[PDB]
Design a protein around this motif. Structure first.
Motif, mmCIF file in Angstrom:
data_model
loop_
_atom_site.group_PDB
_atom_site.id
_atom_site.type_symbol
_atom_site.label_atom_id
_atom_site.label_comp_id
_atom_site.label_asym_id
_atom_site.label_seq_id
_atom_site.Cartn_x
_atom_site.Cartn_y
_atom_site.Cartn_z
ATOM 1 N N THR B 396 0.820 -1.214 0.000
ATOM 2 C CA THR B 396 0.000 0.000 0.000
ATOM 3 C C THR B 396 0.866 1.282 0.000
ATOM 4 O O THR B 396 1.685 1.466 -0.916
ATOM 5 N N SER B 397 0.690 2.160 1.026
ATOM 6 C CA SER B 397 1.414 3.438 1.093
ATOM 7 C C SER B 397 2.934 3.303 1.221
ATOM 8 O O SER B 397 3.630 4.278 0.949
ATOM 9 N N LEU B 399 4.804 1.905 -0.814
ATOM 10 C CA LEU B 399 5.303 2.049 -2.189
ATOM 11 C C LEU B 399 5.372 3.490 -2.670
ATOM 12 O O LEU B 399 5.921 3.737 -3.747
ATOM 13 N N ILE B 400 4.791 4.429 -1.904
ATOM 14 C CA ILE B 400 4.775 5.841 -2.279
ATOM 15 C C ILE B 400 5.380 6.766 -1.183
ATOM 16 O O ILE B 400 5.798 7.877 -1.497
ATOM 17 N N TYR B 401 5.423 6.298 0.077
ATOM 18 C CA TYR B 401 5.985 7.042 1.213
ATOM 19 C C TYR B 401 7.525 6.916 1.126
ATOM 20 O O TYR B 401 8.180 6.203 1.908
ATOM 21 N N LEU B 402 8.084 7.545 0.072
ATOM 22 C CA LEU B 402 9.504 7.444 -0.258
ATOM 23 C C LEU B 402 9.994 8.780 -0.776
ATOM 24 O O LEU B 402 9.301 9.413 -1.588
ATOM 25 N N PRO B 403 11.203 9.201 -0.375
ATOM 26 C CA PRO B 403 11.712 10.481 -0.874
ATOM 27 C C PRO B 403 12.001 10.325 -2.360
ATOM 28 O O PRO B 403 12.176 9.201 -2.851
ATOM 29 N N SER B 404 12.058 11.444 -3.056
ATOM 30 C CA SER B 404 12.315 11.485 -4.477
ATOM 31 C C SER B 404 13.595 10.806 -4.939
ATOM 32 O O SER B 404 13.641 10.296 -6.054
ATOM 33 N N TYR B 421 11.567 9.415 10.640
ATOM 34 C CA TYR B 421 10.205 9.167 10.172
ATOM 35 C C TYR B 421 10.038 8.192 9.014
ATOM 36 O O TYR B 421 8.899 7.863 8.676
ATOM 37 N N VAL B 422 11.132 7.800 8.344
ATOM 38 C CA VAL B 422 11.064 6.854 7.219
ATOM 39 C C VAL B 422 11.976 5.644 7.531
ATOM 40 O O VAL B 422 12.534 5.011 6.631
ATOM 41 N N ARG C 236 8.122 13.183 -3.175
ATOM 42 C CA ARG C 236 8.479 11.942 -3.867
ATOM 43 C C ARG C 236 8.999 12.375 -5.258
ATOM 44 O O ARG C 236 9.020 13.583 -5.564
ATOM 45 N N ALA C 237 9.405 11.407 -6.106
ATOM 46 C CA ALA C 237 9.875 11.701 -7.468
ATOM 47 C C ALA C 237 8.789 12.474 -8.226
ATOM 48 O O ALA C 237 7.591 12.270 -7.982
#
Ligand code: FAD
Ligand code: FAD
Ligand code: FAD
Lengths: 520, 518, 518
Positions: B396-397, B399-404, B421-422, C236-237
């Motif tokens: 779920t999240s 896969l998107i709660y990731l820095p750029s 926090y990550v 994010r990206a």
């Protein structure tokens, strides 16, 4: 009188006639509010009993003996069904796979609890008798006995679906428990869920439920065997599709219900005395928790079940083709594609049984076990494949499954039959008798009450959807398979870091990354 | 110059360095509106080229030769990858299965068009060269050549998705066709649909909108070098270049090294020498090739193993991803992961059966179990789509709660918050947590992940076509007739009057209908 | 300076230009390891900002005001978007449904977190301000403020996916918590999961690993400006930046203008003034807010309409894509497109029912049909995953048989082959064919398409949670008891002895069991 004492020879399993005589014992079965007087003549069981008797007859026929039988490993000089003897190689497992397939073909894959299913339990006892400690000799004796005679066992393991929200030791008024320890044996009482075809068996293995938390009371931590004629053993049968098909149908109208119905009976134990010779695990939480992984049975029976389903899928696949030839829709691309997917599912279960045998591993005392991952895979895929196949049949055969007269009586009345001959004929020259026959065979396979029960069985018999998946994951983790897959993922991860590649064959992006030039 | 003349020895296939040198030829490739000067150095192809070069290097490593290589059967005294020579037993197929698995593990199952895929075509030519009639010697020579050198072939078979509602005779302005027959060879023009990784290949096999038609100028099968005049590729977007220009290996670890560019293949008045012709203006051989050629009955062994290797990777990566979020402790999550495990187990079991049930074919050659090949083709699109949905609905999240970017970790001003926090669950550090989840996202949600889903769903045919071919195999093999014999036996055991077998009881004594309907 | 002080009038919401000016504040945003100086000009955000600015401009167009706007209910004499004021009838909800649809069409259903999404929160505050006790005046003031200005809120509610196996009391080093109570307000620290498009918002509502625990310092609901010290986003990206740097609007038409950056939201010792506090150290109000607050019972009306607009777009785009390949002529293809049409129709029908079955709530406010809201949440992930699979299995190679770039069309050397071999079916030119199919690929297979699939599957909750909430609504509303009354009536009509109703015939005259089992 031991059930195997009906045999005219101690060097072979029962013939069908001896097996039927062995069922005319003290078994106490109830159905339709009355006790069954004789299971071999009762209209709810006589044909299912005759169908099992045919399997025993096949063991002695030159037309099947070689594909079905081996010599015993006991020194008796006798023979037995191949799956009743401990396998000691991958080739032994392949021969057993074929012997299971041959027996299953006799019921077209519709009888799922034939004697070979629990023969895997007899083999588990024979392969690892040391597991049972003080009950080791019972395991050895039971293996010898089952192997030589072809004794028909079933098992009653799952607890009644009552108070599932509670641990087994908190449903004391229902679940199997030790009542009294005596010199002659143990007194047990309680009930188990439906015991499929137990009305036609010699013995039942009574074991602890593994999908439900046991608790802390060791009086529930038991494994033992009970003859079907032990005083206090009672079966309360479900509705009989055999009797209903006999009373209100015919073999033509309900061809599977009329001969392959395996009654799912409630098993009751009212203060039954279990002699010490029949005890295998006693007030032992340690052995109960270790039995699923060390006992062998859980690691053997899905070979039988996967082959039995694959045989049923051989039958369903060709029957779906036959049904579509009736309606004439087999000429269309979409119909052929749907039938092609049924073919793919049918092929899958045979391929899984091949892998079970080819990837077999040594276990203890020279015994071999089928590939454990393939066993778990069959359990997970089968409910999904079966539900999908049934939906494909219904959505393609469509009105062909209902555009059928009520009875063979309609064919036998010329005033009705003249219209059936004209308006209920098959496509491209097929006569109405054959067309109705094929489509009633398909309906009995999936839509009759027998078809409906078979769908419920294929979806649930080895466990809930979550449990079969959890057990598939547990096998991957316990075997080391998951750690080996993880070593590949860890290798991939080790080949780079936040600064770039750690391997010298790949080009870093310093010469092409435009982010500094765009953002700084 | 022949590409294999780049080898320092004629008794082994290319090394990675020789393979890379062999690609520095006159090939005509375009990407981003520009001609590609050199595929080995171009930023859209260099790492995918380096990844294939690693497979060639592995063939010469003593620690890997037992699993990867065998002696040639040509009398050269050389060695080659096991799948480059004709299998002559069930055990030969099992060893080839393992050699394919070993090579596939080098790309974690992500490169689907490596040289071993078309090695099955080289073997099909070598096993049944007599099928090609007057072109028999070409089949024999091509087998020898591919086997000894490890030449990298791809194929361009599927016609462009244009006017699918018409046969392969009514779209002459697009599809491959013969234009001139000459003494030196044949002149051909037309286009084929995407030729996966063809920018990095030595040759492409060109073969026959499904229904062919009635014009024999379309009934062709031949080989074309990648540097022949008129042969050209128009590349799709490069996930490798994009990941290099705007990402990093940390951010896009699969896109950055395993991108197999799906290129449009164009043939503009190409001269194909007679030595490269296999099927010529022959509708009979074109229609018989799928069943008699062998290739269609060999390549799914490679593809099933390659997918099973990718599923080994996805299964453990899903477990790792769920350890990051801490949801692996829940029953429902474990059950979903257990189903991914079951699908992963399935493709390995199918590859086992392909080998153990192998049958003799012609000239001593063995073919894998045909039913298992067709089964892999039908199940793979369903399994892949289901596995991806399971990952998305469970990770779920995460896969998107990731820095750029890796640039966020390298900036302490941002990294201080990522560290707190990550972080991963139960003691895992943020660098490892983000790394695992970016690896999973590149596998399924990046443009590369999206292309891989489109590939797994479609590459061997449409959903109807793979099912139709599965049914045809059952019918043509006799499998359907054997299943039918069981249904006919069941039907013969009764009629409208009762049982025809003596062991069963008729219902005359219990049927109540007469008594009920007076 | 207040963001709404950028308006030239207090009697209307922002224009697009005023909205863009209002974002040029002290906001702390990071992307690609760098601080973002200005979101309105930065290459990762400028077009998504311009896309939101277009929505504000639409409010002041005379041709669009009938569908988009109403008078405020504040006595200011101004106007606002219809969904920014409390609905007081079923017809008010229908007009709001249409105003949401009109705004959503401006992004073709691709922007899911536009200002109207959190306008439902402003309305929840205005409809039931008494719920907040001592903070009632804050609820009233925030409603007035949001309604008159069209202030852009987002929310950060979901806790970071870290230690999910633990309650919201055992992961204190990560989750939002009260740290100090002062005269000027409260000091808070912690992080929330991705705050979609928060880089382009004015304020975020911050609200309560599912199980809360026993510490009341976590039981908070409050508002924070995007330019408050300590409030920061880690982006994010950027699909917008990547499409700009390595693509074009032609190649990535949705990525280039509708990317809503899913940013990590960090709060580092932020001072929240008492005027911005809504629920304070109150487990009772936090547990009652989902059922009594109104927001959870309002926002799925916006989300269902926004998805239905995206499905209008996807449905026709799938038809266009199949016209490109020519496969629309086949029965199976038409049937698959017909199912996409059925799913598209479903979400519009659910939005109809939400409005027609609306019920009175408190203070004259109306709420949409709660069962329909829960139904949209359950069906949407299944419908979306199925629709994407249908597109991939029907458009097939059409989604990959595409040149890399608009630069390929602009190079005549390449374009000559695209014109001949990449034309559309039945007379469609190659420029239009490639354009349509790249639009479809950006919708489902680009990284933006992949993120949108992850969003549609998960944004309102996990698969179990959305189903649990659907069941809870049936139970809490009395719907389940009414369905149960019908089952209990059926059961009461017979017993173990026969029928208890006089119109049916007992089976004593026809049951043959006694006669059969003597
Ligand atoms: C036709 C038929 C024949 C059978 N024959 C036999 C036989 O001969 N011998 C025999 O021993 N058994 C037999 N069974 C029983 C069969 O093995 C079980 O149905 C199966 O193991 C599933 O167990 P269950 O019925 O108790 O379902 P449950 O385990 O009760 O599952 C029902 C639901 O409750 C959920 N659930 C249950 N427990 C938990 C938990 N602790 N945590 C979370 N969720 C939970 C499940 O996930 C599922 O959604 C037969 C069943 C059928 C239908
Ligand atoms: C990433 C990727 C890489 C690939 N790499 C290669 C490669 O290297 N080499 C190569 O040669 N090919 C390659 N392909 C092509 C691939 O083999 C095909 O996509 C596949 O065979 C399906 O054919 P298609 O795309 O033409 O789909 P179609 O056959 O056109 O199917 C699309 C739809 O139309 C329907 N349809 C089509 N024709 C009919 C008909 N006559 N009657 C009824 N319905 C019909 C189908 O049922 C389906 O619903 C690749 C594809 C992808 C996606
Ligand atoms: C692209 C995107 C944008 C988003 N934007 C926003 C936004 O702007 N604002 C915002 O606040 N949120 C946002 N979210 C978060 C979104 O609301 C959540 O992803 C959703 O609520 C699911 O929660 P989760 O990610 O924590 O998954 P989880 O709840 O952690 O579920 C993952 C898995 O674990 C299981 N599981 C978890 N907890 C339990 C439990 N206690 N018992 C049993 N099983 C359990 C689930 O059943 C599931 O299988 C966004 C998400 C995405 C993907």
């Amino acid at each position: 009188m031991k059930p195997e004492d009906f045999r005219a020879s101690t060097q072979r399993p029962f013939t069908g006639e001896e097996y039927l005589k062995s069922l005319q014992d003290g078994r106490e079965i109830y159905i339709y509010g009355e006790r069954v007087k004789d299971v071999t003549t009762h209209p709810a069981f006589r044909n299912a009993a005759a169908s099992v008797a045919q399997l025993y007859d096949a063991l002695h026929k030159p037309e099947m003996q070689d594909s079905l039988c081996w010599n015993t490993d006991t020194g008796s000089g006798g023979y037995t069904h191949k799956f009743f003897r401990v396998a000691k190689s991958a080739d032994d497992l392949r021969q057993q796979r074929d012997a299971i397939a041959e027996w299953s073909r006799l019921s077209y894959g519709w009888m799922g609890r034939t004697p070979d299913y629990k023969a895997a339990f007899g083999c588990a006892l024979g392969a690892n008798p040391g597991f049972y400690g003080q009950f080791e000799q019972n395991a050895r004796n039971w293996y010898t006995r089952i192997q030589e005679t072809g004794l028909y066992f079933n098992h009653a393991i799952v607890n009644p679906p009552i108070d599932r929200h509670l641990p087994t030791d908190k449903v004391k008024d229902v679940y199997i428990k030790l009542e009294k320890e005596t010199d002659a044996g143990i007194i047990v009482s309680g009930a188990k869920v439906v015991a499929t075809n137990s009305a036609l068996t010699h013995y039942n293995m009574i074991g602890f439920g593994s999908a439900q938390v046991m608790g802390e009371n060791p009086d529930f931590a038991l494994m033992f065997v009970a003859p079907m004629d032990a005083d206090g053993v009672k079966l309360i049968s479900r509705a009989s599709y055999e009797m209903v098909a006999g009373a209100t149908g015919s073999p033509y109208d309900y061809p599977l219900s009329s001969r392959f119905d395996e009654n799912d009976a409630i098993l009751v134990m009212d203060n039954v005395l279990i002699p010490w010779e029949n005890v295998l695990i006693y007030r032992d939480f340690d052995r109960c928790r270790r039995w699923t992984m060390e006992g062998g049975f859980a690691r053997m029976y899905p070979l039988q079940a996967c082959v039995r389903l694959a045989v049923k899928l051989d039958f369903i696949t060709a029957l779906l083709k036959k049904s579509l030839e009736c309606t004439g829709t087999l000429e269309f691309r979409g119909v052929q594609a749907d039938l092609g997917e049924v073919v793919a599912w049918r092929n899958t279960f045979w391929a899984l049984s091949d892998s079970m045998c080819s990837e077999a591993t040594p276990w203890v005392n020279g015994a071999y076990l089928p590939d454990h991952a393939a066993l778990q895979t069959y359990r997970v895929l089968a409910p999904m494949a079966y539900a999908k196949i049934k939906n494909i049949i219904e959505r393609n055969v469509t009105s062909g499954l209902i555009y059928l007269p009520s009875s063979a009586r309609d064919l036998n009345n010329p005033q009705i039959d003249q219209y059936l001959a004209k308006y209920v004929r098959g496509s491209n020259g097929m006569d109405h008798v054959q067309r109705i026959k094929i489509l009633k065979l398909m309906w009995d396979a999936i839509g009759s009450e027998f078809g409906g029960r078979h769908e419920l069985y294929e979806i649930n018999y080895s466990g809930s959807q979550d449990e079969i998946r959890l057990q598939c994951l547990r096998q991957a983790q316990n075997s080391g398979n998951m750690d080996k897959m993880m070593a590949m993922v860890d290798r991939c991860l080790s080949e780079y870091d936040q600064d770039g590649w750690t391997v010298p064959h790949l080009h870093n992006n310093d010469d092409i990354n435009m982010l500094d030039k765009l953002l700084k």
